[PDB]
Amino acid sequence: ASKGEELFTGVVPILVELDGDVNGHKFSVRGEGEGDATNGKLTLKFICTTGKLPVPGPTLVTTLVQCFSRYPDHMKQHDFFKSAMPEGYVQERTISFKDDGTYKTRAEVKFEGDTLVNRIELKGIDFKEDGNILGHKLEYNFNSHNVYITADKQKNGIKANFKIRHNVEDGSVQLADHYQQNTPIGDGPVLLPDNHYLSTQSALSKDPNEKRDHMVLLEFVTAAG
After folding, report:
1. How many domains does the chain have?
2. Helix spans in the chain (H)
3. Are 159 and 118 in contact (CB under 8 A)?
4. What is the CATH number of the domain that holds 33?
């Protein structure tokens, strides 16, 4: 166990702020909601604050707080994410869309007062203007995935790799290969885990009364392996 674990009892409010630039198309997203790590449950609504998103919302889900994962009792010594709190951690990814461009992300995940904040900068390059991403050919839905985690002792953090499968309107699947690294912001001791994975399930919806470009998300995440 860790002291940071105690910050996640009950429900914790969440704020997500993303500034993005994909092939020169700049955009911002703001998300708000709550997380219940006891149940591995997240509920969030995201709005684009710059009009219409220039990429499909589903391509941003993984970028838009793994500290809310449910770690079963025998696995709590392997929960790096909560152990880094409240000072938090930097989460960096490369997301390589097969036959298309790449996202590079850097986020800081930390408590600001009683709110768990995820603040992200995203850059996208080498996208095809008529591809699945800039051409908005991805379905508005999300599959279940496993996030494979290993310790990175030299950085006092973790790495992860996983594949996201985005359904395409033509019945194909757009692969997005994810490379992830997380490093603590503070200098305190953290939990460095044995190899394991996070089993993620996500459901996307829309608010019928909402005219802004938005996404409603419900997620359940449980550590295993």
Report:
1. 1
2. 80-83
3. no
4. 2.40.155.10
